[PDB]
Write a protein that binds this DNA or RNA. Structure first.
Ligand SMILES: [Zn+2]
Lengths: 102, 49
RNA sequence: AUCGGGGUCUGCAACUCGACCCCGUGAAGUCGGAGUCGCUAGUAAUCGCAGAUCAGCAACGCUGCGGUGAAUACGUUCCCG
RNA sequence: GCCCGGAUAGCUCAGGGUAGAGCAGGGGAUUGAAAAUCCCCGUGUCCUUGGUUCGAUUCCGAGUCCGGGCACCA
RNA sequence: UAUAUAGGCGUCUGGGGGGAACGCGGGGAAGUGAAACAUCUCAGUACCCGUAGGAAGAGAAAACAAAAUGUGAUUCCGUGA
RNA sequence: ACUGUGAAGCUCACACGCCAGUGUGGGUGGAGUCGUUGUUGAAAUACCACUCUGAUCGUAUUGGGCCUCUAACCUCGGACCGUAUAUCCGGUUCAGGGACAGUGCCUGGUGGGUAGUUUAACUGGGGCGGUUGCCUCCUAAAAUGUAACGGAGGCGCCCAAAGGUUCCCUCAACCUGGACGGCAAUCAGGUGUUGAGUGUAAGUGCACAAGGGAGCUUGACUGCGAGACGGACAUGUCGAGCAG
């Protein structure tokens, strides 16, 4: 189906520059930094509920936004993708960080 | 430098309160000592910066 | 093979040092590198028997016997005498 | 202070699932006798520590010894 | 050399040089002090160049000020120091 | 998730390739793989989203490297004119070089060619040699202090316990008896009052222990500090006690 996969701009190879996401919001998930410095989460699709998935996604972002590495250099949230099973595109706007559900 | 100068900061308010020296080969890990912190007003754990 | 135990024979005498018998133990070894030896027919390959030396044997050595018995030789191009 | 390069067998030097080769040393070959050819050996903390991965000589971090170039007005 | 210009003729009107001090615009040292010396000072002094006037330069806010409805071109004196 | 907006099934081409064999499109027909799948470091390649490694394309931005051209600019190359005299100068024209060179501002190099200066003191004359700060002893003449290129040394550290506190103990040496074991290792008895030891030089001390052992801990604190030592000054040293 569809989910959330953010590209946090950090150096995964450095041990200090690591991320471990863990959020819980129904409207207890886990996340980690992959080899290519990618984060994985669970989200909905375009053909789904509007205020349900959006509200649940904010808590995951806040834990990640509070887990930004100290030594990270450059833009943090380079891109966000919530594409469906076959639906291409569906890229969210990385600028939005406050009042996501509106 | 065998015996470098180290600074101890409170674990609650994070104020640099003391400065001392330790051997970095005998004691390789960050020093942990209970010291009187004037800002808190009591004895709090202190750790090497 | 090695080792433990019990025995037989010669020898005055089997510890260093004989052979053989029985019981048990059961190592390496899966055909062997560069290299290298023997043989042209009853020969090579293989199988057993006897003699000398000798009290006993370390004989799997030496000298003879007989049994079953093969493949190959185009030719001096090359090594040795 | 900043940026690169080097550390691997007795010696020299190549290299995400292999630690290798020549000079060395040793035993045996070929020779009337040697060298070179041959065969087979033993040689090793991959500078020292930790990190990722099922796994690192190889990727990341710190440190030691070195070498080159540019900085340095208590 | 064509448009024409450089140039060539004729005629009027100006300039050149001097002076003791004072002025305006430029160029601009070292001896000395720092108990040494290079930043710094000496000093924009000594000296040099260009120009004046009886004086020269400046002068009429793209100014000060600080919530007071404050001053109101320039120049030169005394304080601020 | 796909299937007559036509699978398997065959057959046509290409790509890599260790041909291990996979991927892409093409032609006929007509219903596929697939889930626990069995070894697994890890699972299915059912598919999907992000993405690494290299190689391919495209748009938009963006920097360099070249070859021409004449028109800026350059020519002490030729010929005319100002000019009767002119190897000066200027102008016209032809022939070459050409956006290079030269120059202006900015910037990095080599730079005794030139300039301004530094290159210590003590010292049985100066040089060579040696020394320059702190700590301990003797000279030092029984308070403190006291010179010489007088006589001897040490320092520019170390310890997270080798600091704080509570409790306990007595060493070195010698004698005797013991498997290796010896002068000298571990064990037992006795004599033994300081001859041992105190991180590190020397001196003053310490057996009442400041020497040896063990448990808990961080006062190797914060705001202060009556009264003093020592001193040209600047420095330096001791301190009962109050509060947290
Ligand atoms: Zn505190």
């Amino acid at each position: 189906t569809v989910e959330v996969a953010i590209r946090l701009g950090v150096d995964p190879r450095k041990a200090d520059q690591m991320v471990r996401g863990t959020v819980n919001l129904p409207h207890k998930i886990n996340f980690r930094v992959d080899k290519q410095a990618n984060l994985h989460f669970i989200i909905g699709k375009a053909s789904f509920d509007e205020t349900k998935l959006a509200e649940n996604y904010g808590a995951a972002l806040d834990e990640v936004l509070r887990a930004k590495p100290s030594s990270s250099k450059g833009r943090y949230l380079k891109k966000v993708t919530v594409s469906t099973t076959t639906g291409p595109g569906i890229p969210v706007d990385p600028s939005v960080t406050r009042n996501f559900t509106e | 430098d065998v015996r470098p100068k180290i600074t101890l900061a409170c674990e609650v308010c994070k104020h640099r309160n003391y400065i001392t020296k330790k051997n970095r080969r005998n004691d390789p890990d960050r020093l942990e000592i209970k010291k009187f912190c004037p800002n808190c007003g009591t004895h709090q754990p202190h750790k090497e910066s």
